[PDB]
Amino acid sequence: KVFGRCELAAAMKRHGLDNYRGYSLGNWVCAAKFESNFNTQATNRNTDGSTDYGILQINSRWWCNDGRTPGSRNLCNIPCSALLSSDITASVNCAKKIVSDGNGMNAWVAWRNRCKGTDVQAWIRGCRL
């Protein structure tokens, strides 16, 4: 599914991401935009053989199981495929564990390079939140 911007904001917000670990909703929307263009189906292969999955491009090196990332962990206890669902529950639940791991949203390299310190509130402007 390709979410609309406000659609994704509303789902993130429902699922409890707004101000999760002190990150306003716009940070999460911005992250999703630059990670997946709001596409739940987005995948990207990393150089190390791991793969990033879903709207927040969660990586199989640590966070999910895809059966093809040697030495990896599955800290969210999910098949990576669950991160591709039109239901964002698994992505949000796993993102909450990621963002609590000590580096906050710096865990998402695209958030650090494209969202951090920007007017991230723009990403939820106009939404009936």
Contact residues for Na ion, defined by CB under 5 A: 60, 65, 69, 72, 74
The verdict on 37 binding Cl ion (CB under 5 A) reads no
Q: Is 66 flagged in the annotation as binding? A: no
Q: Among 18, 48, 52, 119, which one carries the catalytic annotation?
A: 52
**Minimum gap (Å) between residue 101 Cβ and Cl ion:** 10
Active site residue 18: no
The verdict on 39 binding Cl ion (CB under 5 A) reads no
**Minimum gap (Å) between residue 113 Cβ and Cl ion:** 17
Instruction: Give the DSSP per-residue string, the chain.
Output: -B--HHHHHHHHTTTT-TTBTTB-HHHHHHHHHHHHTTBTT-EEE-TTS-EEETTTTEETTTS-B-S-STT---TT-SBGGGGGSSS-HHHHHHHHHHHTSSSGGGGSHHHHHHTTTS-GGGGGTT---
Active site residue 66: no
User: Which residue of 11, 104, 112, 114 would you call a contact of Cl ion, by CB under 5 A?
Assistant: 104
Q: How far apart are CA 72 and CA 50, in angstroms?
A: 8
Residues serving a catalytic function are: 35, 52
Contact footprint for Cl ion (CB under 5 A) = 5, 24-26, 65, 69, 72-74, 79, 104, 121
